[PDB]
Amino acid sequence: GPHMATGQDRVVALVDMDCFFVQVEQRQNPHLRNKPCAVVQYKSWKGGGIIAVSYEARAFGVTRSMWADDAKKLCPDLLLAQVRESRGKANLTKYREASVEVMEIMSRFAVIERASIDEAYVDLTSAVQERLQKLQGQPISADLLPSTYIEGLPQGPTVQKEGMRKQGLFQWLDSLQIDNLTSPDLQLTVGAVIVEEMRAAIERETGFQCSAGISHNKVLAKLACGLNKPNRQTLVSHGSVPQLFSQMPIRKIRSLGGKLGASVIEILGIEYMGELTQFTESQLQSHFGEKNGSWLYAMCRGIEHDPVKPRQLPKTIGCSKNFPGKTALATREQVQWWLLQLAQELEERLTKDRNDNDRVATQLVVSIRVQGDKRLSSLRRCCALTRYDAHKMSHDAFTVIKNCNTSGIQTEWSPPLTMLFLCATKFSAS
DNA sequence: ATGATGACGCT
DNA sequence: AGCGTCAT
Ligand SMILES: Nc1ccn([C@H]2C[C@H](O)[C@@H](COP(=O)(O)NP(=O)(O)OP(=O)(O)O)O2)c(=O)n1
Ligand SMILES: [Mg+2]
Ligand SMILES: [Mg+2]
Numbered sequence: 030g031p032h033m034a035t036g037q038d039r040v041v042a043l044v045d046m047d048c049f050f051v052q053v054e055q056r057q058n059p060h061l062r063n064k065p066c067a068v069v070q071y072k073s074w075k076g077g078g079i080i081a082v083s084y085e086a087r088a089f090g091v092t093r094s095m096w097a098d099d100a101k102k103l104c105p106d107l108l109l110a111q112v113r114e115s116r117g118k119a120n121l122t123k124y125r126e127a128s129v130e131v132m133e134i135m136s137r138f139a140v141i142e143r144a145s146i147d148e149a150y151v152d153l154t155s156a157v158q159e160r161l162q163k164l165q166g167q168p169i170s171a172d173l174l175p176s177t178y179i180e181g182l183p184q185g186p187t188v189q190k191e192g193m194r195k196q197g198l199f200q201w202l203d204s205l206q207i208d209n210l211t212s213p214d215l216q217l218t219v220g221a222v223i224v225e226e227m228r229a230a231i232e233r234e235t236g237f238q239c240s241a242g243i244s245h246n247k248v249l250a251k252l253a254c255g256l257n258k259p260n261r262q263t264l265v266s267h268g269s270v271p272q273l274f275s276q277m278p279i280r281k282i283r284s285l286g287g288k289l290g291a292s293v294i295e296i297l298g299i300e301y302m303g304e305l306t307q308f309t310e311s312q313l314q315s316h317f318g319e320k321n322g323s324w325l326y327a328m329c330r331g332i333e334h335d336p337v338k339p340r341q342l343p344k345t346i347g348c349s350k351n352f353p354g355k356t357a358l359a360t361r362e363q364v365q366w367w368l369l370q371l372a373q374e375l376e377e378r379l380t381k382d383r384n385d386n387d388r389v390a391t392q393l394v395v396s397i398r399v400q401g402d403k404r405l406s407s408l409r410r411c412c413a414l415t416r417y418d419a420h421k422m423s424h425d426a427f428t429v430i431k432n433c434n435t436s437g438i439q440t441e442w443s444p445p446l447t448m449l450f451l452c453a454t455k456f457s458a459s
Numbered sequence: 460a461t462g463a464t465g466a467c468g469c470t
Numbered sequence: 471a472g473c474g475t476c477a478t
Pocket of ligand 3: 045046145147148478
């Protein structure tokens with residue numbers, strides 16, 4: 030009882046932009062606003078590959094990874110914006126710059142952890158402490174939570190969505206203990222007030238809408254965020270966890286969407302996260318390892334300790350291109366020309382990064398894929414990154430990979446290359 | 460023939 | 471170091 034920790038020590042939010050690359054293109058081009066529309070890369074192969082989809086287009090069944098020619102069969106009026114192409118490859122600069130707009134606004138509120146191009150975790154524990162003291166001891170109005178859902182409410186003894194949202198919010202607020210500055214539910218509620226402010230600032234200052242989750246840890250905040258996307262935020266309290274997890278497929282929890290989650294399901298013969306509570310910690314560690322077993326034992330009870338790391342900037346800067354099917358690179362000079370294209374984009378990004386962020390990368394990682402292999406990378410080699418010079422980086426990358434060539438000729442490359450990747454890593458202050 | 464990314468764990 | 475998992 031008195032000594033069982035409940036994982037309620039922190040307030041953590043996750044903010045995730047709604048259909049992010051689409052909103053970037055819709056801000057730029059008002060003709061795309063409030064329309065079914067998608068962002069595509071490489072127009073020549075089947076209209077291009079879809080990498081982002083507006084909610085109007087999702088209603089027709091358009092998804093990521095669809096070819097645009099195929100998406101047009103579901104949604105004949107679908108509008109498209111194409112990713113910029115530079116040096117024969119997709120160039121994601123516009124979306125990285127738009128990401129920086131959002132991450133700089135979030136950082137005014139709390140130190141962030143950049144988790145992807147369009148999301149960040151926030152540890153609001155300290156901001157909440159300070160807002161609680163400024164708040165005297167006065168009630169939190171529903172008006173301060175105009176886009177907040179309380180997961181699991183309403184419950185107990187309306188037929189539209191907004192009606193239900195408010196009924197649940199009313200039940201929550203009506204039962205809150207405001208005189209107790211250490212109540213975790215009160216802390217989450219104040220965290221949600223702050224996230225409303227944060228989301229209003231992002232939309233005001235950028236034009237972009239987003240969703241968010243507010244809970245006691247990263248996994249629950251991430252799960253919470255997706256429950257009422259788009260343009261809404263969701264509070265998942267500790268008390269909401271048993272019911273929420275009772276029908277929650279294991280693969281929906283972050284880090285369990287792959288082979289480990291499949292093995293949890295297969296080895297234990299279960300489907301839902303809540304069902305994990307019936308195993309001892311030792312039993313879970315016996316199947317999945319010490320670290321995973323302890324993580325699962327705590328996570329299925331809503332408890333997780335992974336900190337919000339103070340990191341706003343990516344740790345690596347990389348440039349990648351595939352060469353699928355018949356386009357696989359088969360000669361030495363093809364290989365050199367494309368390494369050079371990659372290296373030129375990398376230099377551009379590295380130089381900008383050194384001026385903006387006062388650091389330099391010191392290691393260059395070169396990765397390739399061979400036709401016939403199975404995996405994301407076939408082979409990775411590093412060397413020193415001592416100069417931001419594209420001809421030197423590309424010459425160096427060739428040097429460290431040039432013996433992967435099984436060909437007995439000089440001018441040919443075998444087995445042909447289906448992917449090249451350059452990645453700058455190991456940053457030092459500058 | 461989705462692709463272009465990016466963090467982090469195991470060894 | 472170099473490989474693999476998981477993720478957007
Ligand atoms: N596999 C993926 C997933 C996302 N992305 C890019 C495009 C997306 O707009 C952006 C953010 O990914 P996301 O958060 O998973 N989805 P998106 O923001 O488009 O829509 P929501 O479902 O979050 O509203 O990363 C990508 O290029 N490849
Ligand atoms: Mg998003
Ligand atoms: Mg995201």
